Every structure is written in C-alpha cells, then in structure tokens.
C-alpha cells in the first residue's frame, strides 16, 4: 500500500583479520508519520546468534528527516568464514517509538563485495 523506504548498507569480510565490516550509510523514502511530520530515525543491528550487547550496534538518531545519513561503520570481531551458514545480520529501523522495518541478511549469501547496496525495509 504505502512505500516503506530503503537502507543503503555496505558489507565486507576481512578473511585474514577475521572481522566483518558493516557500514550503514543512509535511508531514503521513509514514510512520514500519520500526522505528516518526519521521523527521528536510527538503525539497530544484531549479529546473530547470541542476541547480546557484544553483538549489538546502533546508529545515532537523526532529527526530523525522511532521508537520514548516518555514515557509520560497525566492526564485528572475531568472525570466521566457516561460521557464515550460522550467522545473520538483523537490521532494524526505528522512529525514536515506532518500528519502521527490518532487513535480515544471511551471511552465507550476503553481498560481501565492499560496495553500497540498497535494501527494502520490510
């Protein structure tokens, strides 16, 4: 019915350094609030399993926008190629509250090409 917006994310795995680099660039086309005002958006990421603080990261919250730009790089470590079939990134967007959607990326087929890509929020 309504557009939900998209999130630009860049992923890369450093196979020698055993680290997964996740850069959450920005979002576009976020839905306004029902009252017409813009959002105060942030992104939360869990590298699962273990839903614990160690595996949790969050962007800062941008004030009053539908096109936030965070440009933040998160570093997960230690990470091992052999673990990819059993790891996923749970990426959620929030209006600081209201849930604005989720992108769930399985590591085994993730775009680990160090390029930015757009993902639809669900």
From Swiss-Prot:
It comes from the Eukaryota. Residues 9-119 form the C2 domain. Highly expressed in hippocampus, brain cortex, cerebellum and olfactory bulb. Detected at intermediate levels in midbrain, hindbrain and spinal cord, and at low levels in testis. It is found in: Cell membrane; Synapse; Presynaptic cell membrane. Heterodimer with PCLO. Part of a ternary complex involving PCLO and EPAC2. Interacts with RAB3C, RAB3D and RAB26. Binds RAB3A and RAB3B that have been activated by GTP-binding. Interacts with TSPOAP1 and RIMBP2. Interacts with PPFIA3 and PPFIA4. Interacts via its zinc finger with the first C2 domain of UNC13A. Forms a complex consisting of UNC13A, RIMS2 and RAB3A. Rab effector involved in exocytosis. May act as scaffold protein. Plays a role in dendrite formation by melanocytes. This is Regulating synaptic membrane exocytosis protein 2. It comes from Rattus norvegicus.
């Amino acid at each position: 019915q309504f557009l939900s917006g998209q999130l630009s994310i860049k992923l890369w795995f450093d196979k020698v350094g055993h680290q997964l680099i996740v850069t959450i660039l920005g979002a576009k086309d976020l839905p306004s609030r029902e009252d017409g005002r813009p959002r105060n958006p942030y992104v939360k990421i869990y590298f699962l399993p273990d839903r614990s603080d160690k595996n949790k990261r969050r962007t800062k919250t941008v004030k009053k926008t539908l096109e936030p730009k965070w440009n933040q790089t998160f570093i997960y470590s230690p990470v091992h190629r052999r673990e990819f079939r059993e790891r996923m990134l749970e990426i959620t967007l929030w209006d600081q509250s209201e849930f604005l959607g989720e992108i769930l990326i399985e590591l085994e087929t993730a775009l680990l090409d160090d390029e930015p890509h757009w993902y639809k929020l669900q």
